[PDB]
């Protein structure tokens, strides 16, 4: 590549300007994507004859 | 869960909070939870009138529904990484 | 201008290097020790390449980039980037659990340069969290 | 259910609803969701007469005998 | 201890319930669920004598317990 | 044994119904369908405001959310 | 799917209305199932009816968060 | 049944009213099991559409599912 | 977590705007709080010895 793509690419903490040790650290050691780790919600989204029977 | 991991990611950060009853308090966030309740340390003063009456209290626990906004700075966190995080989750 | 093109070329050849040899980080570090205050606008992308190689699948490029880190640590102090040294300390401390010893040693060397350069109080991990992870390393 | 409406079935009941509403009527039927079927239903808000009605056990504030 | 567990240990006790409409409900507790839906006996309200009343948990503001709640409970 | 509210609503399908909301706004029209959450399909609804005011006359099939619904009145 | 449509205005200036006569303009950096929103370079126009006249309070904040229950309208200015 | 209705009203100009009484007239792009409404070319009005049009929005307009009251159509 | 506020005098502000000082002997996932030694912040008005407070009522909590 080039130094242009280098600095333009930056990094997680580089582009993030750091400031969060959970951002850099968590996104680094175990990190796949940052900030990536309800029931009645999926029930509502999933929502007479049958009842009668 | 996205924002859950957002403030779960932001710990020991001075932020300003506005409530539904119009209470605005700056504090250093410490503990987080699934219901997005916040515990601020070093309770500071925002305005004269909007600031409630608490003299000695250095630590608070805010319920997640009561907050209206949460005030940050752009220097505090990068938004784009959260953005592609959003497009990745949903 | 040609000072810019110099560091640009060094970063290009450094990130594009196919062969395994120990010279690039040594001499690149010598350049960075020669010119230091002038590095800041380059100092940021250089560290971008640094982390970029710190995540890589080849232990050769890994320990190579780490050796480059330990050399570049004293120069960053001249630009007063210290928070940037903090995020370096973070990422390296998180990669400290690597299996490959040959890279892990260089990583700990970069830890040594970081902790030596920057004041202890402002060190992120912090130190008292650092050392108990070091106690198993001795074996 | 922690409340047995069988003894309240076919009995005039006074139910409070959300939004400052009061409804009085004889209890025809109910369920585990406390959804109520009232007959000869009247509402006091001052007086509004209704026929048989269906009550939401979801927004139901309270129930009492009448 | 837990509030729900305390209302489980407390059965048949006089207390003064505050609701969102602002009406006092003074009664004697009978049954409690996971939703803290209250049913009281010997009920009298202030802005009416009632033998039994059903109370929704979510509409409650606060509950004034008797002082011996810890002794009679624990 | 107990007559179910879903049985009553099923009975008032395709019949005139006055549904009172949690607010002072009331709707009246012909019931079509519903579900377990009782989201009403109301044919040719008429929006009202008690203490009466006519707001809008709806021509079509309307979907009313089951959250704001308070009382269902057959006829 | 509505959120998938909200993928369009991402990183673009959005006009958002909220409960309590709280209007806010910004660029859209976030959303979720509960419609919790993070905005950058935003500004807040507060509609306040006081003493029987129309008035507004302008709160300028570049980085701020919004809670989903207060969400009323989401569009572009 | 309601899902069938939502599948029928897709791509249809609708008038959707929140709990705030503001009625929006616009094409229905999508909706979910939460009644979240995504419109297009939606215009806002107070109460009935015959009242004053406040502002106009051409792009996609999103609505919140607990805020919406009813969805009508012309 | 509310585990650190147990057996401690705390200042609670409700949604309606009222405020209180009193000890916190219990908490749950719903933020329902068992409260003892109840007193008012502004009015210094003793309410009762034991009360329960629904979670949706709490606007804010504080340590004292």
From Swiss-Prot, chain A:
<comment type="function">
    <text>Participates in pre-mRNA splicing. Part of the U4/U5/U6 tri-snRNP complex, one of the building blocks of the spliceosome.</text>
</comment>
<comment type="subunit">
    <text>Component of the U4/U6-U5 tri-snRNP complex composed of the U4, U6 and U5 snRNAs and at least PRP3, PRP4, PRP6, PRP8, PRP18, PRP31, PRP38, SNU13, SNU23, SNU66, SNU114, SPP381, SMB1, SMD1, SMD2, SMD3, SMX2, SMX3, LSM2, LSM3, LSM4, LSM5, LSM6, LSM7, LSM8, BRR2 and DIB1.</text>
</comment>
<protein>
    <recommendedName>
        <fullName>U4/U6 small nuclear ribonucleoprotein PRP3</fullName>
    </recommendedName>
</protein>
Swiss-Prot record, chain D:
<comment type="similarity">
    <text>Belongs to the snRNP Sm proteins family.</text>
</comment>
<comment type="subunit">
    <text>Component of the heptameric LSM1-LSM7 complex that forms a seven-membered ring structure with a donut shape. The LSm subunits are arranged in the order LSM1, LSM2, LSM3, LSM6, LSM5, LSM7 and LSM4. Except for LSM1, where a C-terminal helix crosses the ring structure to form additional interactions with LSM3 and LSM6, each subunit interacts only with its two neighboring subunits. The LSM1-LSM7 complex interacts with PAT1; within the complex PAT1 has direct interactions with LSM2 and LSM3. The LSM1-LSM7 complex interacts with XRN1.</text>
</comment>
<dbReference type="GO" id="GO:0071013">
    <property type="term" value="C:catalytic step 2 spliceosome"/>
</dbReference>
<keyword id="KW-0508">mRNA splicing</keyword>
<dbReference type="GO" id="GO:0097526">
    <property type="term" value="C:spliceosomal tri-snRNP complex"/>
</dbReference>
<dbReference type="GO" id="GO:0005681">
    <property type="term" value="C:spliceosomal complex"/>
</dbReference>
<dbReference type="GO" id="GO:0000956">
    <property type="term" value="P:nuclear-transcribed mRNA catabolic process"/>
</dbReference>
<comment type="function">
    <text>Component of LSm protein complexes, which are involved in RNA processing and may function in a chaperone-like manner. Component of the cytoplasmic LSM1-LSM7 complex which is involved in mRNA degradation by activating the decapping step. Together with PAT1, the LSM1-LSM7 complex binds to osmotic stress-activated mRNAs to attenuate the osmotic stress response, probably by limiting ribosome access to the mRNA and consequently translation. Component of the nuclear LSM2-LSM8 complex, which is involved in spliceosome assembly.</text>
</comment>
<dbReference type="GO" id="GO:0005730">
    <property type="term" value="C:nucleolus"/>
</dbReference>
<keyword id="KW-0963">Cytoplasm</keyword>
<protein>
    <recommendedName>
        <fullName>LSM complex subunit LSM7</fullName>
    </recommendedName>
</protein>
<keyword id="KW-0747">Spliceosome</keyword>
UniProtKB/Swiss-Prot annotation, chain G:
<keyword id="KW-0539">Nucleus</keyword>
<dbReference type="GO" id="GO:0000932">
    <property type="term" value="C:P-body"/>
</dbReference>
<dbReference type="GO" id="GO:0005681">
    <property type="term" value="C:spliceosomal complex"/>
</dbReference>
<keyword id="KW-0698">rRNA processing</keyword>
<dbReference type="GO" id="GO:0005730">
    <property type="term" value="C:nucleolus"/>
</dbReference>
<comment type="similarity">
    <text>Belongs to the snRNP Sm proteins family.</text>
</comment>
<dbReference type="GO" id="GO:0071001">
    <property type="term" value="C:U4/U6 snRNP"/>
</dbReference>
<comment type="function">
    <text>Component of LSm protein complexes, which are involved in RNA processing and may function in a chaperone-like manner. Component of the cytoplasmic LSM1-LSM7 complex which is involved in mRNA degradation by activating the decapping step. Together with PAT1, the LSM1-LSM7 complex binds to osmotic stress-activated mRNAs to attenuate the osmotic stress response, probably by limiting ribosome access to the mRNA and consequently translation. Component of the nuclear LSM2-LSM8 complex, which is involved in spliceosome assembly.</text>
</comment>
<keyword id="KW-0694">RNA-binding</keyword>
<dbReference type="GO" id="GO:1990726">
    <property type="term" value="C:Lsm1-7-Pat1 complex"/>
</dbReference>
<dbReference type="GO" id="GO:0071011">
    <property type="term" value="C:precatalytic spliceosome"/>
</dbReference>
<keyword id="KW-0507">mRNA processing</keyword>
Swiss-Prot record, chain I:
<keyword id="KW-0539">Nucleus</keyword>
<keyword id="KW-0508">mRNA splicing</keyword>
<feature type="domain" description="Sm">
    <location>
        <begin position="1"/>
        <end position="64"/>
    </location>
</feature>
<dbReference type="GO" id="GO:0046540">
    <property type="term" value="C:U4/U6 x U5 tri-snRNP complex"/>
</dbReference>
<dbReference type="GO" id="GO:0071011">
    <property type="term" value="C:precatalytic spliceosome"/>
</dbReference>
<keyword id="KW-0694">RNA-binding</keyword>
<dbReference type="GO" id="GO:0005634">
    <property type="term" value="C:nucleus"/>
</dbReference>
<dbReference type="GO" id="GO:0003729">
    <property type="term" value="F:mRNA binding"/>
</dbReference>
<comment type="similarity">
    <text>Belongs to the snRNP Sm proteins family.</text>
</comment>
<dbReference type="GO" id="GO:0005681">
    <property type="term" value="C:spliceosomal complex"/>
</dbReference>
<dbReference type="GO" id="GO:0071001">
    <property type="term" value="C:U4/U6 snRNP"/>
</dbReference>
<keyword id="KW-0963">Cytoplasm</keyword>
